[PDB]
């Protein structure tokens, strides 16, 4: 419980501390788990020049900590000017404080099949965050050509010592492949005192393979590592992989020409809008919020598109089976006919790329010297908006639809007439009143943050449940991760767990792991949890590594903190036959408390209490037990020249018209050129700049 605080007396003073003095306690602990490793060693500044470390008296950090807390931008001061963006490895994350649950900390990522309250489902993860979505391409290889080019730089950007001493040393799985096979033949030789040893010919398994397993050693010109996949004490000891990657890529590029296997891009969306031709009566053309690495799965070679969603009929407190196993989900799969293309009906319309790039507002002109390497690369936030036109997906001359439930085909027993079938697909979002809104308040202003600023503990018996009820919530019954890392399934729930990875998903949430099979409102039962406990969302994460704004737990600026994730910066292929372009992660971002859904659930809307869209989740870290979400709106932030000419930037990528925003790079002003003079469910007066509601303006309106 209190050992991280030095006991119950040391926890009591942490409860009474403010967020600045709470941070200084956690950061002197985070930095010693971190500096157990020797950290970043890139270009560095001399013993002077801590005037930047005193310029933090306006906004607080510490400069030599910041050089290692992660790959942060720090400072560059030889002409008092420039930025250093790092690439020399990656840095790990945890936090032993956002939890206090007192048992199973490794289950700090959310519950998985259960609904806490109506604002989570029957509002958010049902009807609205409707589709777990799949795009099927009928190929495999574009992951493996690039991963084998990466494996080739891993092979041969290497020293002549290790060109032997990483291969010929780590050959022990070939030795195990012999001595295990030998132990079969050793035992088979036990009962042969008279019977002829025909088996000596099968004891060529050492000898005729010894020459092959030694010729594969000698040359080592480009084959610079062992041909071996995995090893354990018993299982998963298979070894067969090829070498010389441009010959392996020649095999991949011919396997890419056979339409044998199929692979899926899969992610999550929410319904945000519809184009309004018919006085709101019966809409057919819908817009879905998602993230950009999910929306790039929309490719011209696509064989099918699908939407699986929780039906509106469902009730709170229930716990579901997996997505392919529960009849409370429905799935709608669409496929092309007569050579019609699936992109003729499903389109990525907005991509949130380079949305600051009016003159003087950018950040790339601030890079010191690594702009030699990162030439042409832009900035983005991982958010995209996809159009689906059901009036040309339910057109039987051009596409065939199929309706599925619990892995039955239900197409000929489901709804058939188009306006009712679009309403059964979209959980009737047209005739609902709980349509989406966007969070207009600045999360950086102190009176806004204080609405989410939870107490660590409270007296539930005292009258100040008022002011704990009245906290704003983050809601994310959104995202469907693949069911492979779903730990709530019992070892003996075999049928759910059998097809674990293929075709199957979970309804991940933002809640205590304690709810799982426990919220069921059976007749004649009593509720086992207090109404304050299930009746809320959760909050921001006390993770140190991802945080930029120090007195604001779980607020960050992505470019100063998280400019890149994984090994390689993000590429997006542009249309109109342009090239690929590379982009750094940028914008205001949020760290959700109980949310590391592995292997899917990118594209998941963070919301608050009255169905206001707040952020878009895109990256997970299940060792941090948290992950990262794009805020749609930023008030900007000013660093008082600490970061030179740099600023967080003020923008809105749904409404536009923010002080640093490119004035052609938001949902409204994209939709204005496509549908000039028409209405929308978000834009009922039209897309024109004079019809922004005064809540979403900046600077002349300082309250939002």
């Amino acid at each position: 419980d209190f050992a991280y605080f030095g006991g119950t007396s040391g926890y009591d003073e942490y409860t009474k501390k403010d967020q600045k003095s709470r941070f200084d306690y956690d950061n002197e602990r985070y930095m010693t788990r971190l500096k157990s490793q020797f950290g970043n060693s890139s270009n560095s500044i001399n013993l002077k020049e801590y005037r930047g470390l005193e310029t933090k008296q306006e906004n607080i950090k510490k400069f030599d900590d910041q050089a290692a807390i992660s790959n942060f931008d720090t400072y560059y001061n030889a002409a008092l000017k420039g930025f250093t963006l790092p690439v020399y490895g990656s840095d790990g994350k945890v936090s032993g404080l956002k939890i206090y649950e007192g048992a199973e900390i490794g289950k700090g990522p959310s519950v998985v099949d259960s609904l806490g309250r109506n604002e989570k489902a029957k509002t958010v993860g049902l009807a609205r965050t409707l589709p777990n979505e799949e795009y099927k391409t009928s190929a495999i290889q574009t992951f493996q050509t690039n991963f084998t080019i990466y494996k080739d730089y891993e092979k041969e950007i290497e020293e002549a010592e290790d060109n032997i001493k990483l291969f010929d040393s780590w050959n022990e799985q070939q030795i195990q492949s012999y001595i295990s096979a030998q132990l079969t033949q050793l035992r088979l030789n036990y009962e042969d005192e008279v019977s002829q040893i025909d088996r000596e010919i099968s004891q060529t398994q050492p000898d005729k393979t010894t020459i092959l397993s030694n010729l594969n050693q000698k040359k080592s010109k480009i084959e610079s590592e062992y041909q071996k996949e995995l090893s354990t004490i018993s299982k998963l000891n298979k070894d067969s992989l090829k070498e010389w990657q441009r010959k392996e890529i020649e095999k991949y590029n011919e396997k890419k020409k056979e339409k044998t296997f199929q692979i899926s891009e899969s992610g999550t969306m929410w319904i945000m809008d519809y184009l309004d031709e018919n006085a709101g009566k019966n809409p057919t053309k819908f817009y879905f919020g998602t993230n950009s690495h999910v929306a790039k799965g929309i490719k011209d070679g696509m064989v099918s598109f699908s939407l699986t969603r929780l039906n509106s009929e469902v009730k709170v407190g229930q716990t579901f089976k997996l997505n392919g196993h529960d009849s409370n989900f429905t799935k709608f799969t669409f496929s092309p006919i007569n050579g019609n293309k699936l992109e003729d009906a499903v389109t990525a319309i907005f991509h949130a790329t380079d949305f600051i790039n009016e003159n003087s507002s950018p950040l790339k002109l601030l890079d010191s010297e690594q702009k030699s390497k990162y030439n042409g690369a832009g900035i983005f936030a991982d958010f995209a908006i996809v159009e689906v036109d059901f009036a040309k997906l339910l057109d039987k001359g051009k596409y065939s639809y199929s309706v599925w439930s619990a892995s039955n085909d239900i197409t000929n027993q489901y709804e058939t007439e188009q306006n009712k079938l679009i309403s059964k697909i979209t959980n009737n979002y047209s005739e609902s009143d709980k349509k989406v809104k966007f969070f207009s308040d600045s999360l950086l202003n102190e009176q806004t943050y204080a609405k989410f600023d939870r107490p660590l503990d409270f007296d539930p018996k005292k009258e100040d449940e008022l002011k704990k009820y009245n906290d704003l919530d983050s809601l994310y019954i959104v995202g469907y991760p693949t069911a492979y890392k779903d730990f709530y399934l019992d070892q003996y729930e075999d049928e759910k767990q059998l097809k674990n990875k293929k075709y199957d998903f979970s309804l991940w949430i933002n809640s205590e792991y304690k709810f799982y099979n426990k919220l069921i409102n059976k007749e004649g039962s009593t509720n086992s949890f207090k109404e304050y406990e299930t009746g809320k969302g959760n909050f921001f994460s006390y993770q140190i590594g991802y945080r930029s704004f120090i007195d604001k737990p779980g607020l960050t600026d992505a470019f100063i903190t998280v400019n890149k994730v994984g090994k390689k910066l993000y590429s997006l292929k542009d249309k109109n036959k342009n090239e690929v372009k590379k982009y750094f992660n940028y914008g205001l971002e949020i760290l959700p408390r109980f949310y590391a859904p592995a292997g899917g659930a990118s594209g998941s809307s963070v919301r608050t209490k009255d169905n206001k869209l707040l952020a878009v989740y895109h990256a997970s870290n299940e060792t941090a037990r948290t992950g990262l979400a794009v805020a749609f709106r930023s008030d900007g932030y000013d660093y008082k020249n600490l970061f030179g000419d740099y600023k967080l930037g003020q923008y809105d990528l749904i409404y536009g018209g923010g002080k640093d925003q490119q004035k052609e790079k938001s949902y409204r002003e994209v939709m204005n050129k496509m549908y000039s003079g028409k209405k929308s469910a978000l834009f009922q007066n039209g897309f024109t700049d004079d019809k922004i509601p005064s809540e979403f303006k900046f600077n002349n309106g300082t309250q939002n």
Partner: protein
């Protein structure tokens, strides 16, 4: 006594006894805790205490294990079985000795689990051990040379089994002779040859007049079931789902009723007629029955079920079976107490098909006159999940709960729907069973299962009978779980009895698992821990590696056991406090105690009872 019986055609002298009667007590009737209409009995047939084995009998029992005899295990005897017959037919072909290669191919291709299953029955002899040559026919001249000339071990010892002489095996092994003195003959499917050239087994069967399992299932299918049949077999999953029975034929009659009561064929309401194919004039009890099928996964059938069940009653149309299908499949909190309470006070059959994604058996049917020897508790999911409960008081005036129609095996495909009776290892009491601080209704409901109806198969849980289910109630299985999650006042085994009022004639029950209601992060308990009943929560037995379990309805119990009141703990007060930390995971992890601010701190480990989180 001391009669003769036939066991292998051969007439044999044997000591035979009648099965002891189930002794009902007059307190089992006056508490309405015995069976409501007729006392059940499990051992329907006599016992064999001893059999006079003779040379003539044990050589008949030998020849049956070689041939298969003429019973059910015909065609699986040691020298008459599917693998042995496929090998002998190839040796009977005109080809040269190296056609041994094609017999080995008939064990690698598809049959790899039939060989290496039949092989074992010879293998203890087949591994030479300085004996095999004496049991090898005329091939005794070929063997000592040809032994050197085989390419694989299997190609060799295939040539032993295909050349063994059946005439050498007229000897019975020492253990299988003592089972024959108990009157159980070697099963021809279980027979093997041991090292010494003698017949032994891993399985022995009685004559069919002395089988306890099939005679019980025959008696139950032929007289407890409505829609009875003369066989002993359980019904198939397709028979259970469609509602069909051996010797009965089903007709859909839904059209007149759909026209009268205004429903579509899509509305999930059906009526079907069953009639017996050969009718039975000799007693007027039942030859045909109207059956009502309600698919309550539909929302018209659920909306109308209570209305329809009452319109059929005031119109005076009589239903022999109500079938309620997919209970809890769409919505797991879906209530049925209003629907089950609208059904007649007197019912022939009720089939309830519960969904295992709900497992919501909370509806209660006690305050009735009769279920006329039928309640079927069914699912089309996992029926041996630990979260399956019944209230034992909900069955008070049900004459027979269906315990046949058990259809669980590893050999079914995954990903198809199979229907079976539920296995229950839990007793779960409801809130209305504990009104006045009284423990009376629970001790009645608890002894119903554990002793007053224990000789019946349903009240035995998932393990079934002992050696004498009607006499030694103690040696039999019982549901070893207790759930109190619905009944919020219970904190302990205080006031609960686990023996029959008697003692010298029976074992006392022991529970393996205890679920309790809890509402807060602390388990609040008075100083009743001196007198929580202690040794009664101890698994099946004392020496086991795995300890028994305590659970709570919340799982948030990572704050302390809060001990309230001024009274000091005794020696059993110490022992009871240990068990809540040991047997409950989320308490075991830190051992935290709270003493609220009165008394001495007699305990030396606790917090001052803050109540803040």
């Amino acid at each position: 006594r001391k009669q003769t019986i036939t066991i292998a055609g051969i007439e044999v002298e044997a000591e035979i006894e009648g099965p002891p009667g189930f002794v009902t007590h007059q307190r089992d009737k006056d508490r309405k805790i015995s069976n409501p209409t007729k006392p059940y009995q499990n051992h329907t047939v006599n016992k064999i205490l001893s059999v006079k084995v003779t040379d003539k009998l044990k050589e008949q029992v030998a020849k049956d294990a070689l041939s298969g005899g003429n019973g059910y295990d015909e065609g699986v005897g040691l020298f008459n079985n599917s693998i042995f017959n496929v090998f002998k037919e190839e040796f009977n072909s005109g080809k040269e000795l190296n056609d041994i290669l094609s017999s080995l191919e008939s064990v690698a291709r598809q049959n790899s689990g039939a060989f290496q299953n039949t092989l074992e029955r010879y293998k203890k002899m087949l591994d030479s051990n300085n004996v095999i040559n004496f049991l090898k026919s005329e091939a005794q001249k070929e063997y000592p040379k040809l032994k050197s000339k085989f390419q694989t071990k299997n190609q060799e010892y295939i040539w032993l089994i295909a050349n063994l002489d059946q005439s050498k095996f007229t000897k019975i092994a020492s253990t299988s002779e003592k089972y024959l003195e108990k009157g159980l003959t070697i099963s021809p499917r279980s027979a093997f040859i041991n090292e010494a050239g003698e017949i032994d087994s891993n399985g022995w069967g009685p004559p069919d007049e002395y089988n306890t399992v099939t005679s019980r299932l025959r008696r139950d299918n032929s007289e407890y079931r409505v829609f009875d049949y003369d066989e002993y077999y359980s019904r198939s999953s397709d028979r259970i789902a469609n509602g069909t029975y051996p010797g009965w034929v089903k007709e859909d009659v839904s059209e007149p009723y759909s026209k009268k009561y205004n429903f579509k064929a899509s509305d999930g309401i059906r009526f079907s007629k069953l009639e017996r194919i050969n009718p039975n004039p000799a007693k007027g009890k039942l030859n045909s029955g109207l059956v009502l099928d309600l698919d309550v996964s539909n929302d018209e059938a659920y909306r109308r079920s209570k209305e329809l069940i009452e319109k059929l009653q005031k119109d005076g149309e009589q239903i022999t079976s109500y079938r309620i299908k997919n209970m809890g499949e769409k919505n797991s909190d879906q209530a049925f107490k209003d629907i089950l309470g609208a059904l007649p006070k007197d019912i022939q059959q009720l089939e309830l098909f519960f969904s295992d994604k709900a497992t919501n058996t909370a509806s209660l049917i006690a305050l009735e006159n009769k279920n006329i020897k039928e309640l079927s508790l069914y699912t089309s999911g996992n029926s041996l999940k630990k979260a399956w409960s019944y209230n034992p008081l909900a069955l008070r005036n049900t004459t027979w709960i269906n315990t046949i129609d058990y259809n669980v095996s590893a050999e079914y495909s995954s990903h198809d729907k199979i229907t079976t009776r539920i296995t229950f290892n839990t007793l779960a009491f409801d809130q209305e069973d504990f009104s006045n601080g009284s423990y009376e209704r629970i001790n009645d409901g608890l002894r119903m299962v554990y002793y007053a109806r224990n000789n019946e198969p349903f009240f035995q849980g998932g393990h079934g009978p002992g050696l004498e289910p009607d006499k030694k109630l103690g040696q039999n299985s019982y549901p070893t779980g207790l759930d109190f999650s619905r009944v919020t006042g219970i904190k302990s085994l205080k006031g609960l009895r686990f023996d029959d009022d008697l003692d010298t004639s029976n074992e006392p029950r022991k529970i393996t698992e205890l679920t309790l209601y809890n509402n807060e992060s602390y388990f609040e308990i008075s100083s009743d821990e001196l007198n929580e009943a202690n040794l009664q929560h101890l698994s099946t037995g004392e020496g086991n590696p795995e300890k028994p379990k305590i659970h709570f309805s919340n799982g948030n119990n990572t704050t302390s056991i809060r001990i309230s009141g001024k009274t000091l703990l005794s020696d059993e007060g110490r022992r009871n406090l240990d068990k809540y930390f040991e047997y409950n995971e989320s308490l075991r992890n830190s051992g935290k105690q709270i003493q609220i601010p009165n008394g001495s701190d007699e305990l030396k480990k606790q917090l001052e009872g803050w109540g803040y989180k």
